[PDB]
Structure formats: C-alpha cells, structure tokens
Design a protein around this ligand. Structure first.
Ligand SMILES: CCNCc1nnnn1/C=C/c1cccc(-c2ccccc2)c1C
Lengths: 118, 117
C-alpha cells in the first residue's frame, strides 16, 4: 500500500521541450513485475498502461503516440517516470498516475506549457 | 484479465431515496481480503476506502458520514456495492470506483437526482 509520492506537483515547461514527470512508490529489493501496475492519464486520455510488464500501443491516446513513454529503467527504483518528448500546448493539464504494487494510491500533477514565442 | 465492469453507467434517482451503485470485479471463488482494496470517490471526495478487510471510517468525508456504506456481503461475490442513504441533490455527479485485487482498474458512474413537485 503505503502512498504514491510526487517530487513536483507543478511542472512548467517550454513548447517543444521534453519533460519527465515522476511518481515514486515503495519498492524495496527487486521489482516483482507480477505485482506492478502503472496507469498514467490526463483529461481521461490513456497515456501509459503498464500491467505486470505489458504495454499495448493501441490503448494509448493518439495525441501521446510515439512521444510519451514510461521509463522502465526507473521502475526498478520505485519511480514511475512518464517522459513526454516534444511537449505540445495541448499537453497542459492535470495528470493522474495510478499505481498498484501490493496496495495502491494515486496522485495528481499539473503541467503548464509556455508558448514558443515565434 | 482484471477489468472493473459496471451494470449501470447512469443511475437516475429520487431525492431522499436510497441508491446502491455497483462495480463488479473478477473473483475466482477465492476472495482474499488481504489483497482487496476498494476506493469510492466523487468530485475528489473520499466516500469509501475498504482496505484489507476493514472499512476505513476516518478518511470518509463527513458529508457521507452516516449515509454511504459498502455492502460487505457483496464483496465476496466480486461486487463493490456503494450504498448511499437519503440521497441529496448534492449527491448528483460522477462516482469513481477504484478497485485493486491482484491488478487494478477503475470506472466512472454518473448519478442524476430527481425531485418532482
Ligand atoms: C483494463 C485493464 N486494467 C488496467 C486499467 N485500466 N484502467 N485503469 N486501470 C488501472 C487502474 C489503477 C491502477 C493502479 C492503482 C489504482 C488504484 C486503486 C485504488 C486506489 C487508488 C488507485 C487503479 C485504479
């Protein structure tokens, strides 16, 4: 169980930059993939669905296609790290990470996107 | 595998009646309390937190204090049944059941409240 903990509740980013938003969870030794579920969401649009190690491209929302990815490397450290490359204005909003790894919690994260200033 | 399934996505209810909204989940005739978590929420108000056998009373928001309860009887049958008694207009809105039982899924249910005159 415990609690999902978030380093930063707000990320302010540049248009066309990259960002990695993070949700930490209690890990403790190795990662038992059978126990792990990570869902990232915003505005009820599926960004990531990780289910015991399974991800399907097809479930992802098109706006996030080929840009958002979950850094599997950080998962073993108890860090659900969503990385979105080439941040779009439309990506501004509230993100929900939902994690289960022997008990479950969710946190909300806000994103503000600065204009490109053409 | 794990998918939360809802009989009714909308409930239209009477003011001052009771309602019971339900979220079904896969149980294999097993029903391991230690594994099960049920969170009911609406408009970011915690209604129920069933955690590992017990209802957590403390975290329930005081608007749903003596009114919302989880039907424990149904849980064994893979049915997270939130019952709220004496429905107020304020109880109209979108409910989110989050269930974790060896894997995890959520669904939204909308509630519309009638009062005839
Ligand atoms: C359909 C395939 N299954 C995966 C899936 N699909 N939609 N959502 N989802 C997973 C959701 C999830 C994942 C982890 C924890 C919690 C959760 C549980 C209780 C409290 C807080 C958070 C939830 C609700």
């Amino acid at each position: 169980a415990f609690t999902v903990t978030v380093p930063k509740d707000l990320y302010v980013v540049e248009y066309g930059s990259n960002m990695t938003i993070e949700c930490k969870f209690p890990v403790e030794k190795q990662l038992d993939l059978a126990a792990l579920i990570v869902y990232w969401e915003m505005e009820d649009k599926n960004i990531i669905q990780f289910v015991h190690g399974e991800e399907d491209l097809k479930v992802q929302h098109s706006s996030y296609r080929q840009r958002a990815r979950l850094l599997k490397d950080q998962l073993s450290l108890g860090n659900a790290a969503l990385q979105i490359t080439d941040v779009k204005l439309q990506d501004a909003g509230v993100y929900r990470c939902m994690i289960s790894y022997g008990g479950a919690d969710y946190k909300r994260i806000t994103v503000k996107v600065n204009a490109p200033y053409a």
